[PDB]
Amino acid sequence: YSYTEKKRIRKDFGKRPQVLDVPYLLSIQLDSFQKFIEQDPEGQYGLEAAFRSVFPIQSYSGNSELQYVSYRLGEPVFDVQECQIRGVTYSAPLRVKLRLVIYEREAPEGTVKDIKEQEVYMGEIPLMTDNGTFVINGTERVIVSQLHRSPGVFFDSDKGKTHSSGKVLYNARIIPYRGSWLDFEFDPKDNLFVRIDRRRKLPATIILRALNYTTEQILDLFFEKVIFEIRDNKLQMELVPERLRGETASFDIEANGKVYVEKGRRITARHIRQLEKDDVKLIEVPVEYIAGKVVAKDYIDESTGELICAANMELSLDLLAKLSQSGHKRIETLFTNDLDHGPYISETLRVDPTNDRLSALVEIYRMMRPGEPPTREAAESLFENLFFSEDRYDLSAVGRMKFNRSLLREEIEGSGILSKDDIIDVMKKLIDIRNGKGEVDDIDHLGNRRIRSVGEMAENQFRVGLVRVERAVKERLSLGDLDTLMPQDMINAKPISAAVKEFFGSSQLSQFMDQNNPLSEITHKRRISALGPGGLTRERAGFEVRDVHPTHYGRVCPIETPEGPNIGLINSLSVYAQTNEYGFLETPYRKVTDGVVTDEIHYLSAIEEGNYVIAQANSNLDEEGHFVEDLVTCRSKGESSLFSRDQVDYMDVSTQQVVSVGASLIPFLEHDDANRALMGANMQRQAVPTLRADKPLVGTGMERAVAVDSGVTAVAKRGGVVQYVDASRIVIKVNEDEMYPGEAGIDIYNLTKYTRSNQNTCINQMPCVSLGEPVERGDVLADGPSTDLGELALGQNMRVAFMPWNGYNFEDSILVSERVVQEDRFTTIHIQELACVSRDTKLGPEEITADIPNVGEAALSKLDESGIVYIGAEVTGGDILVGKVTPKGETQLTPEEKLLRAIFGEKASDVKDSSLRVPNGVSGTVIDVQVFTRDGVEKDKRALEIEEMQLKQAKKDLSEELQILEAGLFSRIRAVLVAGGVEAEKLDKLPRDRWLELGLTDEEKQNQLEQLAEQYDELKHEFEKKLEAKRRKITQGDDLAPGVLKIVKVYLAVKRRIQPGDKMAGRHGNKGVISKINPIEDMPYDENGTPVDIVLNPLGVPSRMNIGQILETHLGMAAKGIGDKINAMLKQQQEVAKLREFIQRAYDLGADVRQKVDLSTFSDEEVMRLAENLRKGMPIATPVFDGAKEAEIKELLKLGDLPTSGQIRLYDGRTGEQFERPVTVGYMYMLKLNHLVDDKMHARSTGSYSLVTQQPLGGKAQFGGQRFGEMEVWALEAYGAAYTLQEMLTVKSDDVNGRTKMYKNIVDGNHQMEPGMPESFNVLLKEIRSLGINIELEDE
Amino acid sequence: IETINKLNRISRQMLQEMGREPTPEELAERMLMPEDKIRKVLKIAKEPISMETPIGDDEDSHLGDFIEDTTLELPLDSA
Amino acid sequence: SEAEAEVAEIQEQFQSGLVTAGERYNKVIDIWAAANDRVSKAMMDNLQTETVINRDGQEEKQVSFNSIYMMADSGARGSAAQIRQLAGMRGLMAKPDGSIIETPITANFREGLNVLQYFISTHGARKGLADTALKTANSGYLTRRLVDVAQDLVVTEDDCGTHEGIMMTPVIEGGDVKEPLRDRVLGRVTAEDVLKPGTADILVPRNTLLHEQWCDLLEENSVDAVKVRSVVSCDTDFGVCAHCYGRDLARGHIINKGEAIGVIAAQSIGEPGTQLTMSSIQVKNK
Amino acid sequence: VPLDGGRFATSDLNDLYRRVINRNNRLKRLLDLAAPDIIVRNEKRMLQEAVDALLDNGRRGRAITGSNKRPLKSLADMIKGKQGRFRQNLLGKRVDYSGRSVITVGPYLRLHQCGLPKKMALELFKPFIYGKLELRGLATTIKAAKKMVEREEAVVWDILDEVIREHPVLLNRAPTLHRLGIQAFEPVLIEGKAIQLHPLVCAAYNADFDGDQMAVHVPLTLEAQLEARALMMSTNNILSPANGEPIIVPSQDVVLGLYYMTRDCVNAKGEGMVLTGPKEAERLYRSGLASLHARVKVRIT
Ligand SMILES: [Mg+2]
Ligand SMILES: [Zn+2]
């Protein structure tokens, strides 16, 4: 194993040999945004796609144009951390090259009139960290992938809209990437109709006229031919046999001389078959059969030139006469099978009043621009703009793909613009589905739903900015001068950066990151939603989208989605998933060939999956043969079933890919219900890190890669030897081979100490290593807030036993010991931030100074010179942090205090206090202060003491850096002289600088002397430039608001501990609030006196079925026991060999354990440290659905010399006796939560009041009154407490006379009530009277 | 108004030249007038922000609900 | 294994083509339900009296000491269906369609669910849970309209001096009693004199609270029909009388005048509802 | 109004009034000038438009907006819907003298009791304390009083316990479906920030200790206090008005203890001797000599 694995191994009972190892988890953010930047020449992605798709642009007249060239980005001015500290966006410059080519409208296109090829900055752009956040005003923020109906086309059918009909109505819809929608539909009367974007209904055929088709060409396209021949008097006609199918003979249908079908007889498939086999196509028939048939195409007499029948008109017998007399012994007609080939289009034509292309354009123009006097090109241009202009309609070649496949083309690609072939093919497949062939499609299938990551949205808003530019570009091109108006004398970068900024800071997807837990971060990045733009709404959407669809398998976790109104909408991504290039999804599958499971992989998409047949990972493979058992669990078609062995196409990879990470971590999930796992994995994200990092024993194996891939830890970039160690930084020297030749290869890592999280928690780092040891590359060099040796640790493992206790664990509540509290182990941190702003007023500036009137030296004892707190303080409500004061106005006084300062002579200044203080209820420890000030105002002294010290710190931190880096170099400057003789001790003893004068020679060594001269020169010089830019970055003032003169900021530390009310839980939904802490003596305990830490009520196990905690508990009791054995082996201090035997005997225990590890490979001290790190408990991996078994649990517990049932006689402590029976016992891994009473509790006597209604507020942050809803009125209406009601209606809320009067009657003792009138009432009267109404009262 | 026009028009060109925005130091220089008037106008250019905006991203808190009234009295002061 | 062989038989019959799919469908699903019932029998017989415990004699068995079963029989937590989900196969499962899947569950939580078994539990759990989120809208809406109607109503009088009203007779239909006339009369006030099958034996002078002693008294008599001065039938303009409404249940006595009924009603009716969306004729006895 | 940083904030009506007055005044101008009737017409369509918008914006046609693109709340919206006065601010009111917190169990309690945080009640019952310290005169005035209550002296607590006695208090959990969702208990002071509760009345609350939070109100005036002790009191209410069933049904732990205790095995011991009563049976089991579950002869009365 690896080094960070050698020291603390996690056992495994997984058996399924994994072919694959997990991927990098945060790949999608990186790759998406990368495509948004990455300089694609041809297969345009994001930026270049927007420039190409928009530029070039030419004038409003047609003479001048701007031309795209290329782009380039600057490195950002500010690094990451100054952007965190300052409250500043992290972002990089943008620079586009632009060429103003202009054309003479004198010359035809004599382009050489003007060229201005210059460069333009416009707009910053935020960038992505190595981990995925975007820093914005000093806030780490995350922006979330979206999921929505892909572009293309989508067919549907509502069942009984007119429920009186009880009838089916089919419809089709076209939905592009950009541009307008399009709806096709049927009616009860079987008439095709159109509406655009849901404008009004229109007879569909109108559009086809507008598309320059005649009724002839239309019916040629839609209707197949039925050809008659009037052979000299009588009617014969051509007939394919499968035309009279399920059809009934109207006449005696006979043949050459032969009767197939009689009158009143069905043309059975027998007679279709005789009509087929007999080579019979022509049949003699009655003329009367025609009458009712419709002509297909216009017929005249070549003598007349007159329509004997216009096209699409019903035939007769006088028209059979007159046609054949006019020279028609051929009459093509329209096939019409009301069953299969319906008269939809023709009826729609007979309803359609429009005859020409033009009027069709007019009535479209009238649908969308109602009223307006129509004109030709307004309407032609309108229609052609809608779906035939590149500007206002683009499909996304994605959309072109899906569309084409929906029409069964071969062409993936095409245009973002429609063609008439496309429209009419859609109408054809529509009516085809109206006949019965094919099917409507479904929403909930993933193959209709497309992911939209960051870079695509950024592309969108970027282009919108380009339009905001483009209007004024043209207005300023055609009008203003050409040769002199530079390209950037037109450009304004404000709409662009305003757009990018707007999206990064106002959209629903843009939001603060959940920093309470690395798990919560990574899963907040692996989030997927259908809301936001191009999406849905809670009040609108229903259950269908919320529910699962079987294609979620291997792509979306069904186990992680909230319990509130967002139950189905939000959902998280699965583990081995990826994205289709188009935006759809895919998932790995092992290909199954000849029964042999092929170890290659293919990423089947949302749609390929159902067509093949797919097997499970549960399959007990026949050892590189095939599936052992005949009836193999496989699936296809959107359902599972049992199939054969050689018959298979594909297999799942692992036993996991259905899941997300969170539910990949809950062990013994297979022994649990989905509801309580939902709640477990949800609350698994709301954890808080403990003060320490206590690992879990019951594992899954994914813990490590999550502890790494959050990026929170240090990572060995290039493995090597630990050079320097500290509590704040680490230095490693890089291995020689890994050391690139140019660079010295000495990596250094600066670590983060106690620092605020966005949820006000402790962020911190610590080395998981010693000094002077090799490092395998990729190891963890530093742990974080919730990690240990490279594994996650959200909480702490401890002793548990299931029984009631005197009512203290009544309904899921918890009882807990004192011993836990003495070990601080659930104690946690809540760093906080507080600020004070120095403003400029109408009267003068606010001033930060120690001096404040009417203050005692008690408070002031801790403010330094400038009126600022010394670091190290420990403070409480009422204390003062920053003495700020404000020049004051003046006062209209009362006679009394006037007399009182006429007595004492005391006075005010012309100034008021505005200090920064602790808010009531709070206490804690000041540990850091920061100050920001304008470039232009004096730095208040302490600021100089801060920034100068920030240079003492900084320039030291760099001196060290350069001193080490350069000191290594200073070997060269020693040795290089020494090549070319030797000064064996004349070199060393005399001072090191003066060796250049020692042993010297000609040809090659003078260049050497001056090479060292260069080295010296460089080495000081780089320092000086470093120092220059660095020091000015420290000293340069701050970009603040107007009126804001300087700011202070104060960071605290508060150390909150467990109390009744502080919720806790585990990883199965096994919630619980605390009701008491129990002394060690009143606890239950055992024969050996080791008491319990936590007690639980198993009433709530069976009905909740969260059974894994039981098995987990058993296993925990096992693991600790082994550690206890080893602990006995250490204090008794046995020997190497006994540890060797015992440990290797412990690893090789399970039935068919996948992993096999030997210890003779390891050396002695490895055995030592590993036995020493296991003594608290041997940690184990229970993969989620490849779990362990009762045989293995109980085998292990027998190795522990414990009761196999894990269930022991307990003795009560208060009474000293035994209980009746045994009780289950063992170790749960358990957690604390942010839902702490310290942050929830709130009271209110009397305080603030609002502004319009004057009734109090809500929220503890605003000293809020609690709401008394209508329900809570209806109750008192039930009882009859009119007085309690009136009390809550007048004095506590609105009646100001009442509240003041009441306070005064109280302090006089009197508990007496007077009412007034609520102000919101008379407010309402005033409003109504504003609405033009004489509302008024009938005074008594 | 005219001063604001000149300001926001010049700031664009200064943005081209610098590649960055101008400071009231550099801009008071370019604007020919001293920093006091610049800073003054910058303090004047702000609009109101519409009490009925949802500062609760959910339809929970229209900003007017948040506002306190510090005008009337407090009953303890009266007593 | 048995039922597996059965569906193999019905399978090969469908392969012959004798049987349809719908017939086949209802057939196989029905045998599955049967097998489930049988495992329920086997387990319940294998827990409740599984304990054989001797005492001064050879053997004898009694109600068990299995703590899970004691939790079941108490009524504290659990029930035979749930315990079945722990020990036995857990039913069949409807996919989101409203259909009912063909191949049911075999294993349990103690043994271990399969991948797909869990993946299929998903649909039902998320579905009914989505309903849990999304039925209180209708509940609070309905309740709000009910309270809205029933605001104004309060008892205005002690006795309206009014006349007969509604008849109370039991709701025995379909089987045996579902609301005894005991319960229906309970706390109500008579329309008029009332007598016994031994006839012309009055007990009410047209209005009395018919507490449990009256109700037992008329359980003795074989009466099955009563009349009552109803809340509806009362004539009091702008309210009702105390008698016609009868007993304030939570007091155990006649309602005091001035108490507000309508809110009690709408609360009383809407409060429960949130949970609570969620050939021949053959004489039985003589 | 302003905010801290010089920013202002307004109600959407003022925009509408401005549009109206601009339009009327321009109209008056155009009427001084005998200008063409067409612009008169247009200005008046603009007028009736803006008035109609003031009375309801998104009614007559497509909606009017400020710069946000979300519409301008007219007058009537302030009278209408949830956000109107009625449902939000008039039938429902924020409250003085109230609070809330997490809840946990009080197993030892009696029915009339509520575990109560000190500090929460200290705040809620302040002016009583002040009246009683002006009474005793420890704080001659209210500046002294407030400073003492901030200093949290010893008599603070003794006087807190002095006033709180016989002073009931209301409890409320959401959603307040039926009248038993809100009840009047007596206070009991405890050294913690979490309410305790009498478990049997969790059922009327449909409540569990899975992180739930409850709210507290105070009957200031005497009449509400007596109504609380007499109507909202936990003793007066053990039955629903829907049905006369006990709503004091022992839930899930107590019931197990009963069903375990009252049970008739065969097997343990002590079968078929005789007792003079329950008490020496208690001597047996508190000694641990009998089965707790075993049919045996006794005498009773
Ligand atoms: Mg709850
Ligand atoms: Zn009546």
Side-chain angles (χ1 to χ4, degrees), chain A residues 1271-1272, chain C residues 136 139-140 271 274, chain D residues 172-182 204-206 213:
Chain A
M1271 297 290 164
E1272 296 84 2
Chain C
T136 56
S139 180
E271 187 273 330
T274 295
Chain D
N172 202 152
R173 184 177 184 275
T176 302
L177 290 167
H178 62 287
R179 70 190 198 169
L180 311 179
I182 186 174
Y205 295 156
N206 293 323
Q213 291 178 354

Side-chain angles (χ1 to χ4, degrees), chain A residues 304-321:
Chain A
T304 64
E306 297 178 352
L307 287 177
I308 300 164
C309 62
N312 192 357
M313 190 181 290
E314 286 180 353
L315 294 172
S316 68
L317 291 174
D318 59 353
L319 295 174
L320 194 68

Side-chain angles (χ1 to χ4, degrees), chain D residues 99-300:
Chain D
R100 56 182 285 159
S101 173
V102 175
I103 60 170
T104 193
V105 289
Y108 65 89
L109 298 171
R110 298 182 67 250
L111 186 67
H112 64 75
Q113 290 173 353
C114 60
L116 182 65
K118 290 187 179 171
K119 305 180 184 183
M120 189 174 177
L122 182 61
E123 184 64 24
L124 285 160
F125 297 155
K126 186 183 287 296
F128 303 149
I129 296 162
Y130 288 165
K132 189 168 264 71
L133 294 172
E134 287 180 353
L135 182 64
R136 303 293 182 80
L138 282 72
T140 62
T141 64
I142 290 166
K143 289 180 180 179
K146 177 66 77 178
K147 261 65 188 298
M148 290 172 74
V149 175
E150 285 178 351
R151 285 176 187 172
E152 301 180 355
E153 297 179 352
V155 303
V156 178
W157 304 111
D158 292 333
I159 295 163
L160 189 57
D161 183 75
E162 177 58 27
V163 176
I164 287 162
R165 183 178 63 258
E166 295 294 332
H167 189 70
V169 70
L170 304 177
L171 293 174
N172 202 152
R173 184 177 184 275
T176 302
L177 290 167
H178 62 287
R179 70 190 198 169
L180 311 179
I182 186 174
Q183 290 181 357
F185 298 182
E186 180 174 358
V188 175
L189 294 170
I190 55 173
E191 192 68 25
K193 291 187 293 305
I195 289 166
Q196 297 177 354
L197 184 142
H198 189 263
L200 298 174
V201 292
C202 295
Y205 295 156
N206 293 323
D208 55 356
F209 302 100
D210 59 357
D212 290 343
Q213 291 178 354
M214 286 181 73
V216 177
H217 291 283
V218 172
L220 296 174
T221 190
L222 191 64
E223 292 80 3
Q225 181 168 5
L226 298 171
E227 291 173 352
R229 189 178 293 280
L231 305 178
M232 302 178 78
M233 196 72 193
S234 183
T235 61
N236 298 116
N237 301 117
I238 52 170
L239 295 178
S240 173
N243 55 3
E245 291 178 353
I247 198 65
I248 311 303
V249 67
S251 296
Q252 63 180 3
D253 266 319
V254 63
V255 64
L256 180 60
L258 274 299
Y259 179 79
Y260 184 83
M261 180 171 73
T262 175
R263 182 174 170 174
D264 54 356
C265 82
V266 72
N267 62 15
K269 60 171 71 181
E271 184 64 23
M273 55 72 65
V274 297
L275 282 82
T276 190
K279 290 182 292 301
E280 63 188 359
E282 190 174 0
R283 296 179 67 249
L284 289 168
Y285 177 55
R286 300 293 294 156
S287 64
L289 293 170
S291 178
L292 179 56
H293 44 78
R295 65 185 68 81
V296 183
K297 293 182 182 294
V298 309
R299 186 181 294 170
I300 72 93

